[PDB]
Amino acid sequence: EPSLLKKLLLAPA
Amino acid sequence: ESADLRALAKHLYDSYIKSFPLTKAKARAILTGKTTDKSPFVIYDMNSLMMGEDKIKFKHITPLQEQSKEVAIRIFQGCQFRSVEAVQEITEYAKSIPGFVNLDLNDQVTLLKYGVHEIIYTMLASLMNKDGVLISEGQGFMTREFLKSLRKPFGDFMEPKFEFAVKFNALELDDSDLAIFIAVIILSGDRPGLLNVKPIEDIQDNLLQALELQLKLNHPESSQLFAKLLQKMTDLRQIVMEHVQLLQVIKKTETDMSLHPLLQEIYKDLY
Ligand SMILES: CN(CCOc1ccc(C[C@H](Nc2ccccc2C(=O)c2ccccc2)C(=O)O)cc1)c1ccccn1
């Protein structure tokens, strides 16, 4: 369930 | 006023160059042959797809050819693989749009969710001519005829993107124009479920002013090009919605063709 888009948005750089 | 709009245009272009390896300039150089690189491998049928497999970026359990005994599904799988990476590129770009990462994270998600495919289809036109599309960073050219020959609904996916691209490419935008245009698509304040619209619209107002200025300066002989480009934004939504219905056909009729979870997340409750 954890958003993969959030993961990509929070990833640095 | 316009001083920062030129800086914004340049910032976006620089970010665009950092985010998208195969720019429209590179793609046109390949498609017109004005490159010293070797001609892309032309994939026009089953056999050529098999020989060109080495040119289609595809990292999976087995080689692309072993994904299925059927050409259409190999194409489906390679295209899915590309789309996942396309989404990642567009996300990196979005994070460079000034103000974007200061928005509510849930709104950043929503803007990405509804914007990414519109941007994918916009940028696919950069890689297309009337006869096919560059793939894998210009490592392979897949013919429109071949894609149209795939059995239904597989053969229906790309043709509306080619039809869009031929008309869109007639605007003759370059990467510097495209960098602002796709930023405008991302910062759309009318996406469903946005929690706080004003900050998004404020950013989009600035982006729209920079786009209009950029188009006037870069295309002085193309009166109302801004107006013409704005009229294409709505075509992109129809393409997305039509693409969804085709993915729905796959989902209702084919076995073992679940989408990558990133694509499932994007598509879940889309519209
Ligand atoms: C066509 N092309 C360049 C990239 O084209 C894109 C065309 C469309 C997209 C968007 C993406 N599409 C798909 C997602 C999963 C599976 C198939 C598709 C197709 O769209 C598809 C289906 C059947 C037949 C052909 C395509 C999406 O919705 O996320 C992203 C990229 C390919 C094709 C094969 C391998 C690599 N490069």
Residue numbers in the entry:
A (entry chain C): 140 to 152
B (entry chain A): 235 to 505
Quoted passage from the original study:
The PPARγ T475M LBD mutant was crystallized in its apo form and in complex with GW1929 and the PGC1α coactivator peptide. In a similar way, the holo PPARγ T475M-GW19129-PGC1α ternary complex crystallized as a homodimer and the structure agrees with the crystal structure of another N-aryl tyrosine derivative complex, GI262570. The GW1929 ligand binds in a U-shaped conformation with the carboxyl group of GW19219 making hydrogen bonds with S317, H351, H477, and Y501. The pyridinyl tail is directed towards the β-sheet and its nitrogen atom makes an H-bond with a bound water molecule. The benzophenone attached to the N-aryl tyrosine, also present in GI262570, forms additional hydrophobic interactions, not available to rosiglitazone, explaining their increased PPARγ binding affinity and enhanced coactivator interaction. The mutated residue T475M interacts with the C-terminal Y505 stabilizing helix 12 into the active conformation and leading to a more stable interaction with the coactivator peptide. Consistent with the functional data, monomeric PPARγ T475M had the highest affinity for the coactivator peptides.
PPARγ (peroxisome proliferator-activated receptor gamma) is a transcription factor of the nuclear receptor family that functions predominantly as a heterodimer with RXRα. PPARγ is a key regulator of glucose homeostasis and adipogenesis. The recruitment of coactivators by PPARγ is primarily determined by the interaction of coactivator LXXLL motifs with the receptor LBD. Helix 12 is key regulatory structural element in the activation function 2 interacting with coregulators.
